[PDB]
Structure 1
Amino acid sequence: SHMVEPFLGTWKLVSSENFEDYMKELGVNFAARNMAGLVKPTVTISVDGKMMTIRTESSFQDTKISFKLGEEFDETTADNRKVKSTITLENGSMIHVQKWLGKETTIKRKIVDEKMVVECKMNNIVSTRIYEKV
């Protein structure tokens, strides 16, 4: 397994653009939007054989997912949506699709200059979050 290797590690958020409207588009209630909005999460990406784990830790939230690449799985998101998630590697990006209630959002991560640039998109609203390797 070579294609995941650049994303393996511990990443700490350092910048965020338009996260408020992305969450607004997602339906996150306004109280939760300021819990998520004023915090810098640490995201940990790891592999244990067949299995990948992506842990997100906050002051507030401490959620994580485990999955095999390209195998849909059930996920409860931090805002309590019950989604169907599929995570692939495509063109050197890691792509996470969530589908729920006939809605979809995607989270794309790519390594640029040793930083992890994460693009969150729903319905033409885009948020860009950039993490630094710890």
Structure 2
Amino acid sequence: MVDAFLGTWKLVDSKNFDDYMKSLGVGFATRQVASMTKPTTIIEKNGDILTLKTHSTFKNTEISFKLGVEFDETTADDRKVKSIVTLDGGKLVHLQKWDGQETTLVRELIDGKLILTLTHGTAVCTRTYEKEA
């Protein structure tokens, strides 16, 4: 069910990521470096455990989870959140909750590209990744 998401993905387009980071309270210097990084996202499965790595010259992260089971997460910007990832409409939907706040990280495949939509507050960001062979 998640299998077309698996693999190594490289960032090839970003829209409104500064808006998203600023909504989350990320400081200007961090937003500045993040606006020029191009992460690699690696999505691997082992049985029903998924591991999602995000690698860059600035910040690395890694999470492991089962679909539909809440997990603790510490984000790249150091928020301690309660997370859950599920498949919804063929999209991989990651919801983070903290301090009564929420943000969603939604991944959808369109013409072989992975489109990540990041929503917090009113800010909506769309990032596009292409597979690596």
> Scaled by the length of structure 2, what TM-score is found?
0.97
Matched, 1:28 2:26: yes
Is 1:112 the counterpart of 2:110? The answer is yes
- The count of corresponding residues between Structure 1 and Structure 2 is 132
Match in the other structure for 1:126: 124
Give the one of 56, 64, 67 matched to 2:65.
67
Tell me by how many angstroms 1:50 deviates: 2.5
Query: % of aligned pairs identical?
Result: 55
**2:92 paired residue number:** 94
Name the aligned partner's letter for residue 37 of structure 1.
S
Give the distance between the partners of 2:34 and 2:67, measured in 1 at CA.
Answer: 27
Q: Which residue of 1 aligns with 2:16?
A: 18
Specify the code of the residue in structure 2 equivalent to 1:131: Y
Once superposed, what is the RMSD of the aligned Cα atoms? 0.7
User: Deviation of residue 30 (structure 1)?
Assistant: 1.2
Q: Which runs of 5+ in 2 are unaligned?
A: none
SS at match of 1:33: helix
Deviation at residue 29 of structure 1 after TM alignment: 1.2
**Aligned partner letter, 2:121:** N
4+ long deviations beyond 3 Å: none
Which residue, out of 39, 46, 52, partners 1:41?
A: 39
Q: CA deviation at 1:90?
A: 0.5
SS at match of 1:66: strand
Give the secondary-structure state (helix, strand or coil) at the position aligned to 2:51.
strand
C-alpha displacement at 1:32, in angstroms?
A: 1.1
Matched residue SS, 2:20: helix
Counterpart code for 2:125: S
Shift of 1:15: 0.5
